[PDB]
Design a protein around this nucleic acid. Structure first.
Ligand code: ZN
Ligand code: ZN
Lengths: 148, 83, 109, 99, 85, 93, 99, 82, 94, 108
DNA sequence: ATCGGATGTATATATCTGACACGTGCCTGGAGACTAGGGAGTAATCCCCTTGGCGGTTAAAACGCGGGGGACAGCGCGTACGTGCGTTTAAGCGGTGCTAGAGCTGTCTACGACCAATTGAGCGGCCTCGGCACCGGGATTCTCGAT
DNA sequence: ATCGAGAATCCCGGTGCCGAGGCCGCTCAATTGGTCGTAGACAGCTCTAGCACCGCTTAAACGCACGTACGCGCTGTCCCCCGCGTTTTAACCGCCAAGGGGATTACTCCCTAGTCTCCAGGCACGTGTCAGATATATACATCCGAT
């Protein structure tokens, strides 16, 4: 199908050229389902961690956005523990030109710098504004006891 | 049960009578088709709004009130059928 | 007034003040309607009705009839200048038109 | 030898006749059929109250009478007594119906 | 003269261009891609999100969506892909 | 069944007040009912807009009077204002 | 020997010039005085905002320009190029302004 | 008090309005007719403006009164409020 | 300070920065656009109110707004306005 | 849609749903107002605004300008058929008129 | 300027039919009494902007003149429209039959108003730098008298 | 059919200024959470009137022919708008100065909504009779060809 053809090309581009600090693949037998994994960049308080995520492609694609969820938990204003993230790509600014590699790179960039303008979790952002040191130490300890 | 080319039922004598009531004395031969077109446009414009009004109320019959409301919306009030 | 008779009789009218008050209150016009608005509105409505009925009765008597049909209202409305200005865009069912013929159309002497 | 009127007197007689009466001037059944045809053009399987068709007829006939009055004035303005389609078009333009 | 196949490639569907349409922001994409985006998405540019609300109405009223000057070149110069696509 | 209110009895009362001899048909009664309803809607809507412009929340008698002045032509407006003022003055005492 | 334009070309030049611009065409002070005169006819000892006089001027100018468009069409209908008072009268009568 | 200020609407101003209207040749009796019709229009608008002002217990005819008066007669004006 | 007066200037500028990301707008033009928005709002709301009062209802739902849009707007503007509104409501509900 | 975000962004609009809801509630239109009416009205208003602004910007680009003035709005409204029919009785301040001359008046 | 036909329209009388005007039962909507609270009236204060004036410069208005092009009246042609008659068509009226759908009633559940605590979206005030207005000189192009 | 001179308009480059766009502080209006009363959604039943068919009169539509008078083009006269140059009037701009009245704030009281009870005004239905429409037979006004 046209969608299936889109995933086949994206597979070819992804396999011939891996992204930086990104891994992905098909979780199951079907070509619709996907899984991927990310790591905290060097200039991040979440360094050393490995984070898995699940991707589900709707029937209509790429016109409709794919569902993306986080299995684990991280200390970010945009993350929620249930697996939903605050990105404009997921619901509002979704575009058929965008690829899976592009959105994962965008997730990594969001991990690099917080955007507390539209935070799902209230209390994290205010701690970030008032005092950065407590934010940093809390993030460090939670990555130590949860990311590894 | 389709209906075709019923606008020819607006005959030439009827248009001459409508012109006579308006004070017209002499009529060219090409007036009738133009008048038929004008009447068709007016009827379509009114019936569209009447049908919209009757579709909103989840009904299947066009009542007199729908026609009166459509006429008043277009700017031509009609007295004697209610409202 | 005595504050004991019917409200229309208390104000000295024939149109209903209670129904006008209810229609003002339940008509989605304002949040809270005053107490003297229905009386004023009913008086205005009754005055206009009396005016039109008087003119139509004059026309009907001019036509040697003891009933008022829509034609006797069309004549009365169209002949009066101000009542015609008020009801300018109104169509009256079974009303006809006022008779006039352009002077150019009349026969040459 | 047979008696006939010069062209114009019978027309004036009819003008004086139809400005004194109040009945409708279009036959009822053809108008009803036309209304039903346009209605089925918009939405199919519609039923029509008789009062709806009567109101539509009254509105249409009043509109056409007014339009023909304006057309007569437009024809007279150009030193004429015959109404021609350009008069109808000018009257409809000035009224804003087509602009 | 003739552009290469790399730039004659639709990015929306990763396939050869068929009936290409070029938005006022100069982003070329397949006519089926455009129709699907208009029917389903938010009536904007899939690439840079430059909405064309009235452009689509104006051209569909006159049936001028297709960028014919490029469609003719694609069809004539590369007949192989067009027949199989 | 259903009860349908109308201004028919009051219009007949006014007719018998003006012309004690003339009657009225049914079509003329329908026309008079339509006219009364139409003028009611006109004046009430104008009064509502006047009250909303000035950031009031009441439709008092002066809102109705100004609406009458705005809608009705000259002598009609003067006579209507006089009649309404007389009725309101008689009602309050 | 002196240069002269044939009658009708400066008129078209003025038409092209005045349909490209957007500025007001009536002098501000005389219009303000006329507005004040009419107002003091209605109610005595009145005051006016500047925005009020400007709005009145804009409305009046737009109305007159539209009226002159209709008058031009009426004049052309009668096989002329001049506009005359009867053209204005016919346009206003058809528009329903004078009845 | 002011008297005969309708003559401030000069001949060239009416000619300019006609030129914008798309008129090529103008007769000589147009100007008085134009002054009359403009005066009628101004009277009609200003009467309602003053009525709106008097209802609000004011003494200056604001721009909103003029806008409402114009809108009452189907002459909606954009750019001054509303 | 002067009392606050609300307007649609911020949202109109936000919309303008989508169709033409390199075009500004004057102040008088913004006044005209704000007047246009207010006028169309009043038209649609009034038609919806009359529509609801005709059917002896008491609530203005999305259906009344849809029918009012169909009544007021011209032939081809309505077919797009209804689509935009239906899409917005469907996206907002779920 | 999921909650816990601004009420307009759920619908994807830029116009305010809450202000439209308040205006509908306090405007003396009806006794009660549904929950899905303000969203519909905001979407319609935003669509019309974008439709006018696009054509106005096109006219401004045609006139070598990078700023929209009332003349460009008048041009955009008058040239389009549907927008001209919708805004038919409306007057734009400082908008002028469209340039046309009757073919009879042109020199022969 | 008439006169007689000849046609059409208005006037006087019988009759008979169905719609108007009135009367009866009753039931729902309006009237009467009382309570609570917030909307609007009234007074006091601030300061914005509306009015009034003076001086100058200069763009626009008023006036006069010469002339050509458009408005307007008179003639002549012929073709399209009015009037009258015989014929063909479907409208109008009545009567009967059927059922689709408008209208009303009873249950009940979900949606929308109301209230209180809270905080961030959006408005008021400031500031600056680029887009647009203006000036000055040159290039391009319609216009008209003369061939 | 054209060539050329006078004149109006469009382009291009440089200078300046003010208002459009972005930022900061703040206060009030929209959001969230919880509760409750009722609007309307749905199912069932009645019975009203909208649709369809058939047969018979006769009224209105249709087609044809004859003739006339009105539309339309052409010519000619003349006078009244137009384009241009000169003088005169007052609009426009900038500045200063005063105070009228618009806009906001605080206090209070009285006018309107909400609730309960009750009863009579107006609405539906039934009945009689007379105002008006129709048929019929004269009287008079009006049109038209011919003196
Ligand atoms: Zn494609
Ligand atoms: Zn793009």
């Amino acid at each position: 199908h046209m969608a299936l053809k889109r995933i086949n090309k994206e597979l070819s581009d992804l396999a011939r050229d891996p992204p930086a600090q990104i891994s992905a693949g098909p979780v199951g037998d079907d070509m619709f389902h996907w899984q991927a994994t990310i790591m905290g960049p060097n200039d991040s308080p979440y360094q050393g961690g490995v984070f898995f995520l699940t991707i589900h492609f709707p029937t209509d694609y790429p016109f409709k956005p794919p569902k993306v969820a986080f299995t684990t938990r991280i200390y970010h204003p945009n993350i929620n523990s249930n697996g939903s993230i605050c990105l404009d790509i997921l619901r509002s600014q979704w575009s058929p030109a965008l690829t899976i590699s592009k959105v994962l790179l965008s997730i990594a960039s969001l991990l690099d710098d917080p955007n507390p303008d539209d935070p799902k979790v209230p209390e994290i952002a205010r701690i970030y504004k008032t005092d950065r040191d407590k934010y940093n130490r809390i993030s460090r300890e939670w990555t130590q006891k949860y990311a590894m | 049960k389709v209906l075709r080319d019923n606008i020819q039922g607006i005959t030439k004598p009827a248009i001459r009578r409508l012109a006579r009531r308006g004070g017209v004395k002499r009529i060219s031969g090409l007036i009738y088709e133009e008048t038929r077109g004008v009447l068709k446009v007016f009827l379509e414009n009114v019936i569209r709004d009447a049908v919209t009004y009757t579709e909103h109320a989840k009904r299947k019959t066009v009542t007199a009130m729908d026609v009166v409301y459509a006429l008043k919306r277009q700017g031509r009030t009609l007295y004697g059928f209610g409202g | 007034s005595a504050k004991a008779c019917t409200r229309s009789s208390r104000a000295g009218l024939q149109f209903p003040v209670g129904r006008v008050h209810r229609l003002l209150r339940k008509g989605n016009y304002s949040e809270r309607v005053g107490a003297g608005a229905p009386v004023y509105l009913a008086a205005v409505l009754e005055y206009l009705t009396a005016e039109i009925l008087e003119l139509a009765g004059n026309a009907a008597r001019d036509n040697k009839k003891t009933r008022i049909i829509p034609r006797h209202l069309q004549l009365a409305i169209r002949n009066d200048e101000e009542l015609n200005k008020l009801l300018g865009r109104v169509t009256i069912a079974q009303g006809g038109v006022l008779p006039n013929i352009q002077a150019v159309l009349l026969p040459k002497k | 030898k047979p008696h006939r009127y010069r062209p114009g007197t019978v027309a004036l007689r009819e003008i004086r006749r139809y400005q004194k009466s109040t009945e409708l001037l279009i036959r009822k059944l053809p108008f009803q059929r036309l209304v039903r045809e346009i209605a089925q053009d918009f939405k199919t399987d519609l039923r029509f109250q008789s009062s709806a068709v009567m109101a539509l007829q009254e509105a249409c006939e009043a509109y056409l009478v007014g339009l023909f009055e304006d057309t007569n004035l437009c024809a007279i303005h150009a030193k004429r007594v015959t109404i021609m389609p350009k008069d109808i078009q000018l009257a409809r333009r000035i009224r804003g119906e087509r602009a | 003269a003739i552009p290469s196949l790399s730039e004659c490639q639709c990015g929306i569907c990763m396939e050869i261009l068929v009936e290409p349409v070029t938005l006022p922001c100069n982003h070329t994409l397949c006519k089926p891609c455009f129709q699907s985006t208009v029917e389903k998405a938010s009536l904007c540019c899939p690439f840079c999100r430059r909405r064309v609300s009235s452009w689509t109405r104006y051209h569909t009223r006159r049936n001028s969506l297709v960028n014919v000057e490029l469609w003719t070149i694609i069809q004539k110069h590369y007949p192989r892909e067009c027949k199989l696509r | 069944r259903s009860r349908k209110e109308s201004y028919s009895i009051y219009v007949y009362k006014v007719l018998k007040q003006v012309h004690p001899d003339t009657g009225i048909s049914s079509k003329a009664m329908g026309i008079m009912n339509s006219f009364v309803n139409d003028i009611f809607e006109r004046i009430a809507g104008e009064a509502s807009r006047l009250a909303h412009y000035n950031k009031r929340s009441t439709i008092t008698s002066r809102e109705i009077q100004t609406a009458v002045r705005l809608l009705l032509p000259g002598e009609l407006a003067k006579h209507a204002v006089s009649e309404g003022t007389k009725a309101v003055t008689k009602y309050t005492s």
